[PDB]
Protein backbone atom coordinates (compact mmCIF):
# COMPACT_ATOMS: atom_id res chain seq x y z
CA UNK A 1 0.00 0.00 0.00
CA UNK A 2 1.44 3.35 -1.13
CA UNK A 3 0.75 6.71 0.56
CA UNK A 4 2.04 10.23 0.01
CA UNK A 5 2.80 12.82 2.67
CA UNK A 6 4.88 15.93 2.34
CA UNK A 7 7.38 15.20 -0.42
CA UNK A 8 7.57 11.58 0.74
CA UNK A 9 6.24 8.31 -0.60
CA UNK A 10 5.48 5.66 2.04
CA UNK A 11 4.95 1.98 1.41
CA UNK A 12 3.21 -0.07 4.07
CA UNK A 13 4.13 -3.76 4.11
CA UNK A 14 1.96 -6.44 5.67
CA UNK A 15 4.11 -9.54 6.03
CA UNK A 16 5.58 -11.74 8.74
CA UNK A 17 9.08 -10.27 9.16
CA UNK A 18 12.02 -9.89 11.47
CA UNK A 19 13.69 -6.45 11.41
CA UNK A 20 16.37 -7.83 9.08
CA UNK A 21 13.64 -9.13 6.74
CA UNK A 22 11.97 -5.73 6.86
CA UNK A 23 15.21 -4.10 5.68
CA UNK A 24 15.22 -6.62 2.81
CA UNK A 25 11.53 -6.32 1.98
CA UNK A 26 11.63 -2.57 1.80
CA UNK A 27 14.62 -2.73 -0.56
CA UNK A 28 12.85 -5.32 -2.73
CA UNK A 29 10.13 -2.64 -3.14
CA UNK A 30 12.73 0.00 -4.11
CA UNK A 31 12.38 1.76 -0.78
CA UNK A 32 14.00 1.78 2.65
CA UNK A 33 12.80 1.00 6.14
CA UNK A 34 11.49 4.33 7.35
CA UNK A 35 13.27 7.12 9.13
CA UNK A 36 11.05 9.53 11.10
CA UNK A 37 12.63 12.92 11.50
CA UNK A 38 9.90 15.23 12.77
CA UNK A 39 6.51 15.45 14.47
CA UNK A 40 4.58 15.98 11.23
CA UNK A 41 5.71 12.79 9.52
CA UNK A 42 5.29 11.02 12.85
CA UNK A 43 1.68 12.24 13.20
CA UNK A 44 0.91 11.04 9.66
CA UNK A 45 2.26 7.59 10.51
CA UNK A 46 0.45 7.54 13.87
CA UNK A 47 -2.85 7.87 12.00
CA UNK A 48 -1.83 5.11 9.59
CA UNK A 49 -0.78 2.77 12.42
CA UNK A 50 -3.82 3.47 14.60
CA UNK A 51 -6.08 2.62 11.65
CA UNK A 52 -4.22 -0.64 10.94
CA UNK A 53 -4.01 -1.71 14.57
CA UNK A 54 -0.70 -3.55 14.81
CA UNK A 55 2.99 -2.82 15.30
CA UNK A 56 5.29 -2.08 12.32
CA UNK A 57 9.07 -2.14 12.12
CA UNK A 58 10.85 1.17 11.53
CA UNK A 59 14.44 1.79 10.53
CA UNK A 60 16.00 2.57 13.89
CA UNK A 61 18.59 0.30 15.51
CA UNK A 62 21.52 0.19 17.91
CA UNK A 63 24.80 -1.73 17.95
CA UNK A 64 26.06 -0.28 21.28
CA UNK A 65 23.34 -1.51 23.66
CA UNK A 66 21.21 1.58 23.23
CA UNK A 67 23.82 4.24 23.85
CA UNK A 68 23.17 5.48 20.30
CA UNK A 69 20.32 4.69 17.91
CA UNK A 70 20.86 5.26 14.18
CA UNK A 71 18.54 5.25 11.18
CA UNK A 72 19.19 2.43 8.70
CA UNK A 73 18.66 4.83 5.75
CA UNK A 74 21.49 7.09 7.00
CA UNK A 75 19.46 10.13 8.09
CA UNK A 76 20.78 12.18 10.98
CA UNK A 77 18.21 13.62 13.36
CA UNK A 78 17.43 14.35 16.99
CA UNK A 79 13.73 13.44 16.85
CA UNK A 80 12.52 10.56 19.04
CA UNK A 81 9.06 9.18 19.82
CA UNK A 82 9.62 6.57 22.49
CA UNK A 83 6.59 5.25 24.36
CA UNK A 84 8.26 5.53 27.75
CA UNK A 85 11.53 5.23 29.71
CA UNK A 86 11.72 1.46 29.46
CA UNK A 87 10.94 1.29 25.76
CA UNK A 88 14.47 2.56 24.71
CA UNK A 89 16.10 -0.12 26.88
CA UNK A 90 14.68 -3.46 25.86
CA UNK A 91 16.41 -4.33 22.62
CA UNK A 92 18.43 -3.48 19.54
CA UNK A 93 15.79 -2.90 16.82
CA UNK A 94 12.80 -0.51 16.85
CA UNK A 95 9.15 -0.72 15.96
CA UNK A 96 6.20 1.64 16.19
CA UNK A 97 3.12 0.40 18.08
CA UNK A 98 -0.53 0.87 17.08
CA UNK A 99 -0.45 4.35 18.66
CA UNK A 100 2.68 5.39 16.72
CA UNK A 101 5.04 5.26 19.74
CA UNK A 102 8.43 3.55 19.51
CA UNK A 103 9.72 0.46 21.28
CA UNK A 104 12.96 -1.50 21.09
CA UNK A 105 13.12 -5.28 20.94
CA UNK A 106 15.14 -8.18 19.60
CA UNK A 107 15.87 -7.86 15.88
CA UNK A 108 14.92 -11.56 15.49
CA UNK A 109 11.37 -10.91 16.72
CA UNK A 110 8.52 -11.31 14.23
CA UNK A 111 6.09 -8.47 13.43
CA UNK A 112 3.41 -8.39 10.74
CA UNK A 113 4.23 -4.96 9.37
CA UNK A 114 6.90 -2.55 8.22
CA UNK A 115 6.89 1.04 7.07
CA UNK A 116 9.14 1.93 4.11
CA UNK A 117 9.73 5.18 2.32
CA UNK A 118 11.31 6.28 -0.93
C1 LIG B 1 6.62 -15.92 11.12
O1 LIG B 1 7.75 -16.69 10.56
C2 LIG B 1 8.44 -17.50 11.53
C3 LIG B 1 9.65 -18.10 10.85
O2 LIG B 1 9.35 -19.14 9.93
C4 LIG B 1 7.47 -18.53 12.10
O3 LIG B 1 8.16 -19.38 13.01
C5 LIG B 1 6.32 -17.80 12.78
O4 LIG B 1 5.37 -18.73 13.31
C6 LIG B 1 5.62 -16.88 11.77
N1 LIG B 1 4.53 -16.15 12.41
C7 LIG B 1 3.36 -15.90 11.81
C8 LIG B 1 2.36 -15.13 12.61
O5 LIG B 1 3.13 -16.28 10.65
UniProtKB/Swiss-Prot annotation:
| Annotated ranges, domain C-type lectin | 5-116
Q: How is it modified after translation?
A: The secretory phospholipase A2 receptor form may be produced by the action of metalloproteinases. It contains all extracellular domains and only lacks transmembrane and cytosolic regions. It is however unclear whether this form is produced by proteolytic cleavage as suggested by some experiments, or by alternative splicing, as in the case of isoform 2 that shares all characteristics of secretory phospholipase A2 receptor form.
Tissue and organ expression note: Expressed in podocytes (at protein level). Present in lung macrophage (at protein level). Highly expressed in kidney. Also expressed in pancreas, amnion, choriodecidua and placenta. Isoform 2 is expressed at much lower level.
Q: What subcellular locations does the record give?
A: Cell membrane
Protein name according to UniProt: Secretory phospholipase A2 receptor
Indicate the span of the full protein covered.
Answer: 1117 to 1234 of 1463
UniProt function note: Receptor for secretory phospholipase A2 (sPLA2). Acts as a receptor for phospholipase sPLA2-IB/PLA2G1B but not sPLA2-IIA/PLA2G2A. Also able to bind to snake PA2-like toxins. Although its precise function remains unclear, binding of sPLA2 to its receptor participates in both positive and negative regulation of sPLA2 functions as well as clearance of sPLA2.
| Subunit structure, interactors included | Interacts with sPLA2-IB/PLA2G1B; this interaction mediates intracellular signaling as well as clearance of extracellular sPLA2-IB/PLA2G1B via endocytotic pathway. Interacts with sPLA2-X/PLA2G10; this interaction mediates sPLA2-X/PLA2G10 clearance and inactivation.
All disulfide bonds of the chain are: 93-107
Superkingdom of source = Eukaryota
**Domain observations:** C-type lectin domains 3-5 mediate the interaction with phospholipase PLA2G1B.
Q: Which residues are glycosylated?
A: 7
Amino acid sequence: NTLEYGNRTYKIINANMTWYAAIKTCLMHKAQLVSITDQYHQSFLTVVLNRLGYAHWIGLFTTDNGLNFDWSDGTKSSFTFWKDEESSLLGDCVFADSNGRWHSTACESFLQGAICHV
